[PDB]
Amino acid sequence: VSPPPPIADEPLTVNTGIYLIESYSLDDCAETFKVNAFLSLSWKDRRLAFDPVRSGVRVKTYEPEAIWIPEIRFVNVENARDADVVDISVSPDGTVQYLERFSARVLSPLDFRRYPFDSQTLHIYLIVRSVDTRNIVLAVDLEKVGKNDDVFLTGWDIESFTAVVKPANFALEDRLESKLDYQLRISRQYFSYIPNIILPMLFILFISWTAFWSTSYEANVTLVVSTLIAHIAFNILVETCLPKTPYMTYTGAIIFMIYLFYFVAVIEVTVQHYLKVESQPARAASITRASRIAFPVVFLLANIILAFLFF
Amino acid sequence: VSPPPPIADEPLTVNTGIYLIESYSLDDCAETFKVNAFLSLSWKDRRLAFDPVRSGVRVKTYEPEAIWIPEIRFVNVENARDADVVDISVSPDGTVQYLERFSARVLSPLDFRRYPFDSQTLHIYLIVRSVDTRNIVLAVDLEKVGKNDDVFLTGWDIESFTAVVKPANFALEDRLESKLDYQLRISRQYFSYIPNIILPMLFILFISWTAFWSTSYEANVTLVVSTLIAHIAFNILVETCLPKTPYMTYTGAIIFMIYLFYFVAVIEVTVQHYLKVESQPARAASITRASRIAFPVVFLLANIILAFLFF
Amino acid sequence: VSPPPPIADEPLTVNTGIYLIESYSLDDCAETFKVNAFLSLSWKDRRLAFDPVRSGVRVKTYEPEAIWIPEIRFVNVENARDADVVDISVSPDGTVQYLERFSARVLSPLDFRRYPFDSQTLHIYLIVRSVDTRNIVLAVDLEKVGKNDDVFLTGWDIESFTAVVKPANFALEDRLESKLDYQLRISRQYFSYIPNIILPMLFILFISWTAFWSTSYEANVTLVVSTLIAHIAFNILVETCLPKTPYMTYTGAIIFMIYLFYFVAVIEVTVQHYLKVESQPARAASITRASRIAFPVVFLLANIILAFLFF
Amino acid sequence: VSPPPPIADEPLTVNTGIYLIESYSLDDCAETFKVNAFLSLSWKDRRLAFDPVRSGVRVKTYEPEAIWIPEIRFVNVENARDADVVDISVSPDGTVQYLERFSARVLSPLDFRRYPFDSQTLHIYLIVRSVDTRNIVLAVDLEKVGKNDDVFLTGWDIESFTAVVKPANFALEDRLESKLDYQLRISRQYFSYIPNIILPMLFILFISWTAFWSTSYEANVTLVVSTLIAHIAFNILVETCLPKTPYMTYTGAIIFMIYLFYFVAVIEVTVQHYLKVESQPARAASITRASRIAFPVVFLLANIILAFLFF
Amino acid sequence: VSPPPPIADEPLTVNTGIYLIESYSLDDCAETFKVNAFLSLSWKDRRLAFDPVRSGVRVKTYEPEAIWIPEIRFVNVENARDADVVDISVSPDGTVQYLERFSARVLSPLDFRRYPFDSQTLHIYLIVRSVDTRNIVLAVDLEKVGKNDDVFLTGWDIESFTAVVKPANFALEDRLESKLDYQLRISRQYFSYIPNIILPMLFILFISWTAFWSTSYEANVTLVVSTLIAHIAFNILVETCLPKTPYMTYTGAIIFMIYLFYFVAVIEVTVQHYLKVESQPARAASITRASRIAFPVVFLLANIILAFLFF
């Protein structure tokens, strides 16, 4: 049939809950994550209320086709979720207790500015469009909101699974819509980042700095240029592990700065050679001697500045 | 039943509207984008007209099987859309208000000539094939054409979501077809393009220009050729965030020009060495001294010419 | 029900037509292409004959389950097509006019020997298996064979969409099968192939040829070997663009020849050094001087020979 | 109908059994694997009991819709399994022998710390949610738990397929849930890892150690830096064989250590040159002479330490 | 209804036949191959027998739901086949002639030890589980086993499509199962392997051998190490068209040997330099002179040993 009628003039309250069973396929590029969970729904339908000591027990079961069920959808899913109704139970008062198991690919924007020290809030937005007969409003039953303890996303610490109790009620295409924000909080657990990305990248840069204890222009050109190639090769090696964002990231700023340093090291190597060749070895020597301290110090300072700007 | 009959001899007007809920998976290579939206349909079916007084209730709800619904399809979709009828509402005059939520992978050609300063117009073409009994014509209800504020496509600014009100009515396979052009305007927001692509690429090129302050042929060969390798290695690194195109792009033209510059720098390095070896060091020195200014100037000029040609 | 009965002993003619709505996902590696088109079918089933006067209607509309429809399949599809019956129209003589919109991934062999100056004929084979009751034969209604003007395949010029009118009638597993060849002719458009693949590849090779104006064995080893690395790096860069083939392609023959040239250039560099070292500088000088003309000339000649062999 | 009623107040026991037909698509990155297996279910339903003599038959076959079947689901699947009921058989007492063939993509966490000498325990968790009328409990029929001998996962030795007989009975969303742990034990068989990964990687490192029999700073810089590039290039080559891991792996630790060794070799090469240049050739020579033994010994020592820490 | 009853105590014989329409998507990594074929089935069901005279025909057509059909499955498929019943024909004696068109992704292990001179036998295992009423046994109708002449797998010669007539009858989960082995024989046709992989790889190795006509340690270090980089770069280039295998392949053995040769060439270059430096130029010269013949000879010999050892 159609929606339940109101006692007075009130909207229908659909008590919702989401219990996370599985979390997988967090795609950093697509900004999507796959979820496998329970969706619990509860609402009052008077037309279904019954007498207990006349019925032979206290709670009866229905098929989805037999009764009216609210049309709940998710806002930020790519395709409609794959759902399987687990159970429908009517208490004597007429309260319906719906339960389904669903899997869905959820689109939630990600902010990689602080990579690999970034935290994310993954959203699952529940929605219900009000009907002509009556208005439908979503609510949160906190007893029904949780997550399985072994829920995992490799590379992340799963912080919390909560819901913003107060729904976002608004008008859309001339009709009322009640929205619910379910939040999955995750923070990045990237340990190997140091021995995998930073450390070998810094060793290559440090090798270039040995050109400050050499006067051989040929040896210096080989040091600075070949390390620059090794650095680029190393990025090609590590690119897989990085964000690929249209905005500047923290790790990306360090990498950019390392490119600047190779350029400055070339200028020095070039300058030192020109001065030597132009019979000014005292200046060439003082510049090289300064560079030995200037390069690490300016590097360390600029990194402190960067860290400060990002955090 | 079959389509509603005409009052006179007029075609049936189906008032359409698309409201963008989500936009995702813009594939630059496939020239496709995924969309999750509402499709609203409106027409008049006199056969469904009712007396609100005798019926008591002012709007009646129907199941898709119960009434006639026009067969609306999308022209530029890979497979048929995944749709879910949200609501069907009938008013006393026989006005039908249809609403469905659909997801679809839309094929729309992209023009990368101005990358990364390119703008795109994504198309969603609505179509209806006329029946034997009467002709069907599409129309645009602008109240029903919009987009959710949260609608995002990482790397792009979502400009507008509009529809070309005037349908494209034409004959096909001996029947009338009424087409509607819905347009999603996007412009690229690639800030990080400068520190990610251009700047490190220019530093490598600038390093090869240091061969103009050196007389060592061995050091110069290492500078020019090793930077050329570094440049190629760098492009392999950035390959991913450059579009694969059968036509010349703006970024592609800069990159091609940088390859030409490495070739010219080799010629110079070669020429300077030959002259020195052929006991003409005055010419060798004047060419190298000129190159120091010629190379940056000719580069800067050619880039101005390129920018002008593309914009 | 079962198939329509013959007036005499004649086969049933199914008039077919394919109208290309869209063409996408041409996979050069898989030798597959995706298509979205109309399939029109027309046959006479007298059992459906009606009196327009008695029925009140001039044309009767049926559901696919209501009437007999020939089992048309495609030979060269990955999985069965995704079809959506648009319309079934019966005229009083019993002529059925069927129309469906379908999407399918078609397997059609590709010949890359002339890449990037290759043209392809993409096939879509329609088939019908005859029944015991009567033989079924396919036919082409040319009024119903076409393609939308907007039909595109990035990197190709869509030449024509035609059908070989004469069906291929043959026996298979003790029954008659009537086959139809629909052909989509495409020719490659790769304007950017010259500035993207050939030109930078030729510049690298030309850099190696500068070793013919040098006597420094160390500088020459660096020129030849570093260019060889740059060439390999460049090919890894263009890998994607080139097709992966178990046969020799035109572009592939050029690339192979460029590898041979690097080897010959090494031999020269090696020979010139040995002669100089073995106190024969007059020969070393004459070989190097010859190489300056020999290398470009032999290269240009071998390319003319290759072009001739392939075209 | 609804669930079978209890004789007393006992829960319903569903005897389960999974027989592995095929194992494929072990995705090291996704931490998923695909499975094709039989799912056997057994329970007693008194309502189905029959006298074989009066009925004439020893066994009765039913359609899934005809009888009550428990709702068994898998916990750690991406989407619901693709199942096909093979057979349903009832014995005179009301015992039901259910059998289905299913395929499913299973999510099971993987531990790469000991790669390539790692072993994995793959989990397939069976679950049943209890109903209002009676509690449902899962059990293991070991006669029905097995695997086809042909079962393979390229690169692994399939050790065992077993089930933890004792179910995990617990409460969830106000109802009892009975869980079963099916375990597939696999151990990696990567022999080709030595000639494919380690040996060529060690040869490159050993080439860098030849700088200890050279006094040419230019030759030494080329040896150390060019091998460092070759090492990075080699890792890019083998990157596909190694997994993306947020934790340090054994192979990962060796690779990190090899990066440290290239850095130390640079320091030595740099130190030896500075001492020579600073007119201390006796120290330079003694350091280089020590390095010849120090480098292999410290390397061999640190690898023994690493192996010990990981095993 | 249920299965046909036996005349005497015999099992039911299901005559099978597979006719290959299309072969595509041979995935060397997944060890899977996609196939599009006809599956013909034939068995006797007396319940369906008729006198052609009284019943009004010779043969009659049934719907799959109307009659009993044996449950034939494939053992080595990832998911259940996509099948479409083409025809069901019952002859006067009750001989059922079933025909369906199916597509399936078939898992068949591959042996890359002889790559690219390998041959493969692709298996399609047909199976039937016996019922309580009677045992079911599979048989091969050779008239119904074939393949379309157009059947292709790019890079392979399709040798034969046959079936091992004698089924594999065995017990599983307390019931009889009858298995059939259908074999697709393919042999690799990788012509372009020589100019694409071997030849450029050998040229790089040969370039390293020029260090045997040089006394310049700096030039030699550049030759050996830069070619080693070029070799690795070339392997990254050919990575794609080489088997990723947990076992040693023929090509893999050649490639490993090439890595060993670069290491030995380094030792020589190192030895020759040390002897020269340690005032023993006569030995240095004799070693270098020997290596000129030793290297090609030992290489050519080891390749003959390998070839032999593998074929």
Short mmCIF file of N, CA and C in Angstrom, two decimals, chain A residues 55-103:
data_model
loop_
_atom_site.label_atom_id
_atom_site.label_comp_id
_atom_site.label_asym_id
_atom_site.label_seq_id
_atom_site.Cartn_x
_atom_site.Cartn_y
_atom_site.Cartn_z
N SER A 55 -2.92 -13.24 19.15
CA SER A 55 -2.03 -13.59 18.04
C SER A 55 -1.09 -14.80 18.25
N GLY A 56 -0.94 -15.27 19.49
CA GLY A 56 -0.15 -16.47 19.78
C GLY A 56 1.31 -16.30 20.14
N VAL A 57 1.83 -15.07 20.01
CA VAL A 57 3.16 -14.55 20.38
C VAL A 57 3.08 -13.01 20.38
N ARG A 58 4.23 -12.29 20.46
CA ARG A 58 4.35 -10.82 20.56
C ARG A 58 4.89 -10.05 19.35
N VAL A 59 5.71 -10.69 18.48
CA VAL A 59 6.32 -10.02 17.34
C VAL A 59 6.13 -10.78 16.03
N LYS A 60 5.58 -10.10 15.02
CA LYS A 60 5.39 -10.74 13.73
C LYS A 60 6.27 -10.22 12.62
N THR A 61 6.51 -11.08 11.64
CA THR A 61 7.42 -10.92 10.53
C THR A 61 6.71 -10.74 9.21
N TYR A 62 7.19 -9.78 8.41
CA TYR A 62 6.68 -9.49 7.08
C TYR A 62 7.72 -9.55 5.96
N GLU A 63 7.23 -9.70 4.72
CA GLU A 63 8.02 -9.68 3.51
C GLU A 63 8.04 -8.24 3.00
N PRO A 64 9.16 -7.74 2.41
CA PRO A 64 9.19 -6.33 1.98
C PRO A 64 8.03 -5.86 1.10
N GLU A 65 7.50 -6.76 0.26
CA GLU A 65 6.39 -6.48 -0.66
C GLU A 65 5.06 -6.30 0.08
N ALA A 66 4.89 -7.01 1.22
CA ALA A 66 3.67 -7.01 2.03
C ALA A 66 3.36 -5.67 2.69
N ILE A 67 4.40 -4.96 3.16
CA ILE A 67 4.21 -3.71 3.88
C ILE A 67 4.89 -2.53 3.20
N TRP A 68 4.54 -1.33 3.66
CA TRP A 68 5.15 -0.10 3.18
C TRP A 68 6.48 0.05 3.89
N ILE A 69 7.53 0.36 3.11
CA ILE A 69 8.89 0.59 3.60
C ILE A 69 9.37 1.92 3.01
N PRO A 70 9.98 2.83 3.82
CA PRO A 70 10.43 4.11 3.27
C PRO A 70 11.56 3.94 2.26
N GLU A 71 11.53 4.77 1.21
CA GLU A 71 12.55 4.75 0.17
C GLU A 71 13.81 5.49 0.64
N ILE A 72 14.71 4.80 1.38
CA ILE A 72 15.98 5.40 1.82
C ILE A 72 17.02 5.14 0.74
N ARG A 73 17.76 6.19 0.38
CA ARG A 73 18.83 6.15 -0.60
C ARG A 73 20.07 6.79 0.03
N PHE A 74 21.24 6.63 -0.61
CA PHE A 74 22.48 7.25 -0.14
C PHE A 74 22.78 8.30 -1.16
N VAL A 75 23.27 9.44 -0.71
CA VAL A 75 23.53 10.56 -1.61
C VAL A 75 24.80 10.31 -2.41
N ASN A 76 25.92 10.08 -1.70
CA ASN A 76 27.25 9.95 -2.26
C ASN A 76 27.70 8.52 -2.63
N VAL A 77 26.84 7.76 -3.31
CA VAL A 77 27.20 6.44 -3.83
C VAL A 77 27.29 6.58 -5.34
N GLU A 78 28.14 5.77 -5.99
CA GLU A 78 28.28 5.83 -7.45
C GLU A 78 27.04 5.19 -8.12
N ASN A 79 26.76 3.93 -7.75
CA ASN A 79 25.56 3.21 -8.19
C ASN A 79 24.77 2.90 -6.94
N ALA A 80 23.48 2.56 -7.10
CA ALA A 80 22.63 2.19 -5.97
C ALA A 80 23.24 0.96 -5.29
N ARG A 81 23.26 0.97 -3.95
CA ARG A 81 23.83 -0.09 -3.12
C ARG A 81 23.23 -1.48 -3.45
N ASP A 82 23.99 -2.54 -3.16
CA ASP A 82 23.55 -3.91 -3.36
C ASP A 82 23.00 -4.29 -1.98
N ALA A 83 21.66 -4.36 -1.85
CA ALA A 83 21.05 -4.66 -0.56
C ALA A 83 20.32 -5.97 -0.53
N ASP A 84 20.27 -6.57 0.66
CA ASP A 84 19.62 -7.83 0.93
C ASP A 84 18.92 -7.68 2.26
N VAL A 85 17.57 -7.66 2.26
CA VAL A 85 16.76 -7.56 3.48
C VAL A 85 17.01 -8.80 4.33
N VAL A 86 17.53 -8.58 5.54
CA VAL A 86 17.87 -9.63 6.49
C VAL A 86 16.62 -9.99 7.28
N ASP A 87 15.89 -8.97 7.80
CA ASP A 87 14.68 -9.16 8.62
C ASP A 87 13.77 -7.93 8.73
N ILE A 88 12.46 -8.18 8.83
CA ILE A 88 11.40 -7.19 9.07
C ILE A 88 10.58 -7.72 10.26
N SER A 89 10.47 -6.93 11.35
CA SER A 89 9.75 -7.31 12.57
C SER A 89 8.83 -6.21 13.14
N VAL A 90 7.52 -6.51 13.25
CA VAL A 90 6.53 -5.58 13.80
C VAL A 90 6.23 -5.94 15.25
N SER A 91 6.42 -4.97 16.17
CA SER A 91 6.13 -5.12 17.59
C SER A 91 4.61 -4.84 17.77
N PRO A 92 3.93 -5.27 18.88
CA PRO A 92 2.46 -5.08 18.96
C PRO A 92 1.94 -3.66 18.72
N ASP A 93 2.68 -2.64 19.22
CA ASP A 93 2.35 -1.21 19.08
C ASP A 93 2.33 -0.68 17.62
N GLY A 94 2.88 -1.46 16.69
CA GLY A 94 2.94 -1.13 15.27
C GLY A 94 4.30 -0.66 14.79
N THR A 95 5.33 -0.75 15.68
CA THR A 95 6.70 -0.36 15.36
C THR A 95 7.40 -1.40 14.49
N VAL A 96 7.84 -0.97 13.29
CA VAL A 96 8.54 -1.83 12.33
C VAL A 96 10.05 -1.76 12.57
N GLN A 97 10.71 -2.93 12.61
CA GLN A 97 12.16 -3.04 12.76
C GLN A 97 12.75 -3.77 11.56
N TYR A 98 13.24 -2.95 10.61
CA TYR A 98 13.83 -3.34 9.34
C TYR A 98 15.33 -3.49 9.48
N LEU A 99 15.90 -4.45 8.74
CA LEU A 99 17.33 -4.71 8.69
C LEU A 99 17.72 -5.31 7.36
N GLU A 100 18.75 -4.71 6.75
CA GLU A 100 19.31 -5.15 5.47
C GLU A 100 20.81 -5.10 5.52
N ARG A 101 21.45 -5.97 4.75
CA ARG A 101 22.89 -5.95 4.61
C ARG A 101 23.17 -5.39 3.23
N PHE A 102 24.02 -4.36 3.17
CA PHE A 102 24.32 -3.75 1.89
C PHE A 102 25.82 -3.55 1.69
N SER A 103 26.23 -3.46 0.42
CA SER A 103 27.58 -3.11 0.04
C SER A 103 27.45 -1.91 -0.90
#
